[PDB]
Amino acid sequence: LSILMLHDPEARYLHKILNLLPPEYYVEYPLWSNVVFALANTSANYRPLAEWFSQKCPEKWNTGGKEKLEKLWNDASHHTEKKITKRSIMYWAHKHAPQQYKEIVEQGYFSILAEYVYSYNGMLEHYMIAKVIYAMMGNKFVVDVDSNGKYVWFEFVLPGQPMNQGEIWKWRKEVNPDELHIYISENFSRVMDRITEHIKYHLSQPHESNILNYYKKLLKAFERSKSKIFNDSFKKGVIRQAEFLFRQRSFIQTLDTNPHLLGVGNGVLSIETIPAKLINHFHEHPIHQYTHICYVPFNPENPWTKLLLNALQDIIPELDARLWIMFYLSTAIFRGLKEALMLLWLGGGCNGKTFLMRLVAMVLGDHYASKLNISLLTSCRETAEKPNSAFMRLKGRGYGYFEETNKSEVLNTSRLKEMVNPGDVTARELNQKQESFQMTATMVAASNYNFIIDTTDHGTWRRLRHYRSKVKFCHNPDPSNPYEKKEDPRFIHEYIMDPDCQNAFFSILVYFWEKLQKEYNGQIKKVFCPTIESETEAYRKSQDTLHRFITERVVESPSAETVYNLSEVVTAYAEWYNTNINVKRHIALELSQELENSVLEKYLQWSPNKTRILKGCRILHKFETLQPGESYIGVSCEPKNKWWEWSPNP
Amino acid sequence: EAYRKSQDTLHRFITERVVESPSAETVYNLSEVVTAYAEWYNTNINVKRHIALELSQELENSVLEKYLQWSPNKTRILKGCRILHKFETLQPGESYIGVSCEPKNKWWEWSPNP
DNA sequence: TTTTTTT
Ligand SMILES: Nc1ncnc2c1ncn2[C@@H]1O[C@H](COP(=O)(O)OP(=O)(O)NP(=O)(O)O)[C@@H](O)[C@H]1O
Numbered sequence: 134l135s136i137l138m139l140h141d142p143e144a145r146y147l148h149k150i151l152n153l154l155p156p157e158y159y160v161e162y163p164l165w166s167n168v169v170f171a172l173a174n175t176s177a178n179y180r181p182l183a184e185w186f187s188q189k190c191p192e193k194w195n196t197g198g199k200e201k202l203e204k205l206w207n208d209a210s211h212h213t214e215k216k217i218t219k220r221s222i223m224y225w226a227h228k229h230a231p232q233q234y235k236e237i238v239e240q241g242y243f244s245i246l247a248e249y250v251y252s253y254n255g256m257l258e259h260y261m262i263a264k265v266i267y268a269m270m271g272n273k274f275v276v277d278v279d280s281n282g283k284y285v286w287f288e289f290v291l292p293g294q295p296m297n298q299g300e301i302w303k304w305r306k307e308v309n310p311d312e313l314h315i316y317i318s319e320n321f322s323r324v325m326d327r328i329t330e331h332i333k334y335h336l337s338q339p340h341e342s343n344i345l346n347y348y349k350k351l352l353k354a355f356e357r358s359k360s361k362i363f364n365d366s367f368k369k370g371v372i373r374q375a376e377f378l379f380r381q382r383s384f385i386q387t388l389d390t391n392p393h394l395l396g397v398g399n400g401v402l403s404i405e406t407i408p409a410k411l412i413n414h415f416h417e418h419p420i421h422q423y424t425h426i427c428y429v430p431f432n433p434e435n436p437w438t439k440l441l442l443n444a445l446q447d448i449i450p451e452l453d454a455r456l457w458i459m460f461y462l463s464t465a466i467f468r469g470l471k472e473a474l475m476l477l478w479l480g481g482g483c484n485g486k487t488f489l490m491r492l493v494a495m496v497l498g499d500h501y502a503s504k505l506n507i508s509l510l511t512s513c514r515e516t517a518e519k520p521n522s523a524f525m526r527l528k529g530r531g532y533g534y535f536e537e538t539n540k541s542e543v544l545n546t547s548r549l550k551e552m553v554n555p556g557d558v559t560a561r562e563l564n565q566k567q568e569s570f571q572m573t574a575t576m577v578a579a580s581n582y583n584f585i586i587d588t589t590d591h592g593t594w595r596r597l598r599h600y601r602s603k604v605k606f607c608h609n610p611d612p613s614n615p616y617e618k619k620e621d622p623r624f625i626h627e628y629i630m631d632p633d634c635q636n637a638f639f640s641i642l643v644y645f646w647e648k649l650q651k652e653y654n655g656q657i658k659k660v661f662c663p664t665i666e667s668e669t670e671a672y673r674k675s676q677d678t679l680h681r682f683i684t685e686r687v688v689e690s691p692s693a694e695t696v697y698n699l700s701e702v703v704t705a706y707a708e709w710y711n712t713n714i715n716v717k718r719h720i721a722l723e724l725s726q727e728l729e730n731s732v733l734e735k736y737l738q739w740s741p742n743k744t745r746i747l748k749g750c751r752i753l754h755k756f757e758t759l760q761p762g763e764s765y766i767g768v769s770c771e772p773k774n775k776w777w778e779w780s781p782n783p
Numbered sequence: 784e785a786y787r788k789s790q791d792t793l794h795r796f797i798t799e800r801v802v803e804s805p806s807a808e809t810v811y812n813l814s815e816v817v818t819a820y821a822e823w824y825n826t827n828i829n830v831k832r833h834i835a836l837e838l839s840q841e842l843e844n845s846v847l848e849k850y851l852q853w854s855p856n857k858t859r860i861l862k863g864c865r866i867l868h869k870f871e872t873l874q875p876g877e878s879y880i881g882v883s884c885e886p887k888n889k890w891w892e893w894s895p896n897p
Numbered sequence: 898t899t900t901t902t903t904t
Pocket residue numbers: 444445447448480481482483484485486487488606619620621622623624625626
C-alpha cells in the first residue's frame with residue numbers, strides 16, 4: 134500500500150507524530166474523527182488517515198466503519214467553516230509526552246537542518262545537507278562498493294517514474310544518483326525556503342537587547358549559502374559525501390542470491406510457496422535483474438495458452454515424453470542447485486527445435502538464460518588463465534541451450550562432468566580476476582545427426598538424456614503421414630516475438646514447475662517416462678562399441694587350440710576402431726582393464742606367467758569367415774483432449 | 784608397495800617377453816632389449832616416446848644384469864635368454880627370467896601407542 | 898588486461 138510514500142518524507146514525519154499521539158484516540162470514534170478533520174485541514178491527500186490506519190487500529194472501533202470515516206474526510210476536504218491547524222496536533226503531542234515529543238522531533242529533517250544552520254551561523258557545507266538528504270531520502274537509494282573498488286548507486290523504482298520497461302519494484306543500477314541531484318535543486322530548495330521563513334519570523338520578534346543584529350547576520354549568511362544548492366561542484370561534493378551515509382555493506386553480494394525470487398515485468402514473482410505470488414508493492418528483497426515478461430496466472434482458456442498447448446501437443450506426440458520435457462524445461466526458472474541432468478534433442482529436418490528452446494530462452498531473458506556455443510562441449514579445453522568469456526555466460530542463469538553441430542561432433546566428457554554436476558566451476562572473466570561460481574543451469578542441446586560418447590563409465594551416463602523428434606514439419610508437401618504436419622512460419626517469425634505468447638508460455642512454465650513441486654518432491658528422476666528411458670538405453674547401447682565388437686568379431690570355437698591374449702584383442706579393437714569413427718588414439722592399459730569386466734570374464738582365465746591366456750574365442754580378423762561350430766560369446770494412454778494435469782498413475 | 788610394483792612396466796616386460804633359454808646362443812645387445820621394451824610399453828602401456836640411452840640404463844639396472852655381459856668389442860649383450868618376440872613362444876627350459884583392526888565403540892579415537 | 902602471440 135506504501136502507507137509512508139518514499140516520494141514524500143513528510144508522510145513519515147507525520148506518522149511519527151501520529152504514533153506520538155496518546156492511545157486514547159486508539160479504538161474510539163469522536164476525537165479520532167477530530168484529529169482526522171484537523172489533519173485533512175492541514176493536508177487532504179489521503180496520507181494522514183492512512184497513517185491513522187497504519188499506526189493505530191483501522192476499524193477495530195467499528196468493523197466495516199471505514200466508509201463513515203471516508204465520508205467525514207470528504208466533508209473535511211470540502212469547504213469547512215472550522216479550520217484546525219497542525220499546531221493543535223503538536224499541542225496534543227506535547228500534552229501526552231513532552232520528552233517523547235522532543236526526542237521524536239530531533240530526528241526530523243527540518244530539525245537537523247535548522248540545528249546546523251543555527252549552530253554554524255548559516256554556513257552550510259557538504260556533509261550537513263548530505264545528512265539531511267539521507268534523513269529524508271534514505272529508503273529509496275543505496276550505495277555499495279563493487280569488485281573494482283568503485284561506489285555504485287542503486288535506486289528503488291516506484292510506479293510513477295520515468296522508468297525503463299520492466300524495472301518496477303526493483304533496484305536499478307546508477308553510475309550517478311540522477312534523481313538525488315534534481316531532488317537537491319528542487320525538494321531540498323523548498324525546505325531551505327521554509328528555514329528562510331523561520332528566520333524571518335524570528336527577525337519579526339522584538340529587538341530585545343542585541344539579538345536582532347545577530348539575526349540579520351544569520352539571514353544574510355543563509356541567503357548567501359542558499360544559492361550553493363544549484364552549483365555543480367557543491368552538488369558533486371554533497372553526493373560524494375552522501376556515499377558514506379547511504380552505504381550498505383553487504384548489498385551487492387546479496388543482490389541476486391535468492392533462487393525463489395524472479396524479477397518480472399510487473400514486479401517480483403515469488404515461487405517460495407504454492408501458489409506462486411506476485412509482489413507488486415514495496416518489499417525488502419534485493420532484486421536487480423529481471424525479465425521483460427509479465428506474470429499472469431496459468432489459465433488454459435486464454436487463446437494464446439490454448440495455441441501454445443496445442444503446439445506442444447504437435448511437437449511431442451508421446452504424452453509421457455511431453456510431460457517429462459515440460460517438467461525438465463520448467464526447472465529453468467529455478468537458479469539454485471539442481472540435479473545433474475542433460476538433455477540431447479535430435480531432429481532430422483524442420484522440427485520443434487529453435488522454437489521451443491528459443492521460446493524458453495526468450496521468456497527467461499538475457500539475465501536468466503543464454504545461448505551457448507558447441508565449442509564449450511566438443512573442443513578441447515583451453516589453459517585456465519586465458520579469460521574464457523564464453524564460459525562466463527552461465528554464471529547466474531538457470532537455462533542454457535546449444536544449437537550447432539558440424540558433422541556428428543564428439544563431445545568432451547570432462548566438460549560434460551564439469552558443466553552438469555552441482556559443484557563449483559573456476560573461470561576467469563575477461564580483464565578480471567579468476568573466480569569460482571556455482572553451476573545452476575538446465576542445459577539442452579539440439580543436434581542434426583548425433584553425438585559420439587567415447588566413454589562408457591557410469592559417471593557420464595547417469596547425467597545424459599536423449600530424445601528424438603518424431604514429427605516432420607513440411608507444410609507444402611504434407612502427406613497422409615500422421616507424424617507429418619503442415620507448418621506455419623509464424624511460429625518462428627511472429628509468435629516467438631509476440632509478448633502475449635511469451636507471457637502465456639511463461640505461465641505454462643510456472644504451472645509445470647508447481648506441478649513438479651506438488652506431485653513429486655521437485656525431483657525429476659521420479660518422473661516415470663518409459664519413452665525417454667528407452668531412447669537413452671538404445672542410444673547408450675549404440676554408443677557402447679565394446680559389446681558390438683564382442684558380438685561381431687569374437688566367436689565361440691569348440692576345441693580351439695589357439696591362444697588369444699589381451700594385446701591381440703586390444704590390437705584387433707584398434708584396427709576395428711580404425712575402421713570405426715576416427716583414428717582415436719587411446720590407452721591400451723585402460724582398454725585392458727575395461728575389457729577385463731566386459732562379457733568375456735566368464736571365459737577369461739589366468740596364466741602361469743601372471744598374464745591373461747584366454748583360450749578359444751578366435752577372432753575373425755576379416756570379413757565373413759564363419760565358424761563351423763556354433764554359439765556366440767556376446768549372447769546374441771494418450772490424453773483425451775486434455776493434459777498438463779494428467780496424473781492417474783502418480 | 785602394490786601400486787609401485789604394478790607401475791613398474793620394465794619388470795612386467797622382462798617377466799612377459801624374456802624367458803631363460805638354456806644353452807641359447809641368442810645375442811641381445813641393449814638396443815634389441817630397448818626396441819622390444821619400447822614396443823611392449825607402447826603396445827601394453829600408453830604409446831609414448833622413449834630415450835634409447837635412458838632405456839638402456841633402465842633395462843641394464845634389472846635381473847638382465849645376471850644374463851647381461853660385455854662383448855669383446857665392449858658392448859652390453861644378453862647371453863641366451865631368447866626373447867618371445869610374440870605371444871607364447873616361451874622357452875620351457877629353465878622357465879622364464881622374470882620371477883613369476885575393528886572399531887569397538889567409537890572409531891574417531893584409537894590406540895595412542897598401538 | 899586485453900589485443901596479442903604463444904604456435
Ligand atoms: N508446432 C508447430 N506448428 C506448425 N509449424 C511449426 C511448429 N513448430 C515449428 N513450426 C515451423 O517449423 C519451421 C521449422 O523451423 P525450425 O523450428 O527453426 O526448424 P528446426 O528444425 O528447429 N532447425 P533446422 O532443422 O536446422 O531447420 C518454422 O518455420 C516454424 O514456423
